[PDB]
Amino acid sequence: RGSFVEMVDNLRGKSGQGYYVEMTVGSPPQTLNILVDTGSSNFAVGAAPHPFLHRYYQRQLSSTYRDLRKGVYVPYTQGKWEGELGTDLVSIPHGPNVTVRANIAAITESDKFFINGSNWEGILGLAYAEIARPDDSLEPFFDSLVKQTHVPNLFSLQLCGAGASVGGSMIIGGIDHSLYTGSLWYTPIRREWYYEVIIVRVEINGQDLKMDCKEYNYDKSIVDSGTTNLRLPKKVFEAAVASIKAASSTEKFPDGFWLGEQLVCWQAGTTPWNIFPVISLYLMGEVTNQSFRITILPQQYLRPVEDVATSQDDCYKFAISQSSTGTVMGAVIMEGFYVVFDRARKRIGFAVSACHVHDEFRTAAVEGPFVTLDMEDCGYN
Numbered sequence: 001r002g003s004f005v006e007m008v009d010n011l012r013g014k015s016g017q018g019y020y021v022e023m024t025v026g027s028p029p030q031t032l033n034i035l036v037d038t039g040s041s042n043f044a045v046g047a048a049p050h051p052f053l054h055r056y057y058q059r060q061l062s063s064t065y066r067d068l069r070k071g072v073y074v075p076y077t078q079g080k081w082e083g084e085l086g087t088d089l090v091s092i093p094h095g096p097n098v099t100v101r102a103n104i105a106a107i108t109e110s111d112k113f114f115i116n117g118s119n120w121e122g123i124l125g126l127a128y129a130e131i132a133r134p135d136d137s138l139e140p141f142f143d144s145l146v147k148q149t150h151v152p153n154l155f156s157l158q159l160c161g162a163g164a165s166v167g168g169s170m171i172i173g174g175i176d177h178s179l180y181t182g183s184l185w186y187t188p189i190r191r192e193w194y195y196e197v198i199i200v201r202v203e204i205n206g207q208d209l210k211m212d213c214k215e216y217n218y219d220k221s222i223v224d225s226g227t228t229n230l231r232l233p234k235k236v237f238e239a240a241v242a243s244i245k246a247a248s249s250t251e252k253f254p255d256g257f258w259l260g261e262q263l264v265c266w267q268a269g270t271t272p273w274n275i276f277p278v279i280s281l282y283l284m285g286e287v288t289n290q291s292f293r294i295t296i297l298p299q300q301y302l303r304p305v306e307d308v309a310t311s312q313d314d315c316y317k318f319a320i321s322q323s324s325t326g327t328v329m330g331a332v333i334m335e336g337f338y339v340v341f342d343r344a345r346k347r348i349g350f351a352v353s354a355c356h357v358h359d360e361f362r363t364a365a366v367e368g369p370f371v372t373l374d375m376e377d378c379g380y381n
């Protein structure tokens with residue numbers, strides 16, 4: 001409890017390609033790098049020689065592989081994979097010292113799923129059975145781990161961005177106190193499917209968007225380490241960029257930029273962070289009529305793009321985007337915070353990350369309590 005030395009710094013990644021952890025599957029163990037995704041619930045690994053893959057799961061080499069005689073076809077908005085279901089022995093070498101028998105979907109065909117030039121070969125979906133494919137009877141990894149071992153039913157994530165290569169920590173079974181500063185503030189998980197939460201107020205530099213808060217959660221809001229952007233419901237995105245545009249009007253940007261349709265560039269070491277506003281989400285708290293507020297900086301929502309062959313300046317992408325799936329607190333939000341997925345008490349904790357990217361004037365912030373009435377009105381049905 002509170003001290004997990006062996007698990008600190010156990011994530012790696014490249015800017016734009018997500019955070020992965022090393023896992024082993026089968027006997028003898030096959031090492032694979034696996035994307036950590038709190039927005040899905042399947043453990044799915046490449047199992048055929050796709051040319052983007054450094055390596056892949058070779059079921060023939062494993063004496064412990066048990067076939068489930070069942071295929072699965074999984075399309076997403078972007079891309080798709082199909083695979084064959086089975087179970088095998090799984091471990092996390094920089095995670096707890098245990099081996100579990102888990103469902104694995106051996107990916108045998110995929111489109112627009114793997115990233116060319118990335119270093120991972122599968123995804124670890126850490127959300128709940130209700131959204132597992134093909135259905136909720138395919139027990140997700142984390143449920144198998146807690147069912148079969150003494151590992152406590154929680155995990156926490158510190159995702160560290162950069163300004164090159166990313167890193168961070170996934171602490172499985174506890175919280176490590178050196179990963180954050182100040183206090184953890186907790187928000188209820190509204191329903192265990194995605195890690196769904198309820199946003200109760202949104203401010204852009206302390207000015208409130210002043211929308212029916214049902215708008216912030218239409219049709220859900222979720223915490224999701226497998227998406228880069230902060231995604232906002234269309235109506236709220238419209239309000240938010242208009243307010244951010246206005247706060248930054250000391251400089252002008254093409255309109256394409258606010259749509260994530262073009263990048264914007266400054267002379268190296270001259271990004272004007274100061275003209276961009278902080279953005280605060282207030283989340284439903286643990287106590288009736290109580291909320292707390294998280295705040296992110298332009299450093300989280302302006303993402304550097306390197307390997308840009310138009311020019312060799314400092315080029316950024318606006319990473320707040322409109323959504324048709326509700327609010328998505330991706331890496332744009334998580335990179336500011338230590339986030340504790342406290343599945344045993346159905347709640348998510350936030351604290352200021354010990355590693356977040358900041359400057360001399362502003363840091364990301366987690367502050368409470370605030371008095372907010374009618375917070376139950378904010379959830380969408």
Ligand SMILES: N#Cc1ccc(C(=O)Nc2ccc(F)c([C@@]3(CF)N=C(N)OC[C@@H]3F)c2)nc1
Nearest residue numbers: 016017018037039040076224225226227228331
């Ligand atoms: N930061 C960051 C970051 C960059 C890339 C990636 C990435 O490629 N993720 C990724 C790639 C392929 C995926 F198919 C997913 C899924 C799998 F379910 N998971 C979520 N949650 O949303 C979309 C999709 F449903 C995520 N993730 C995080």
Ligand code: NA
Nearest residue numbers: 146147149150
């Ligand atoms: Na247990």
Ligand code: NA
Nearest residue numbers: 177178180181
């Ligand atoms: Na601490």
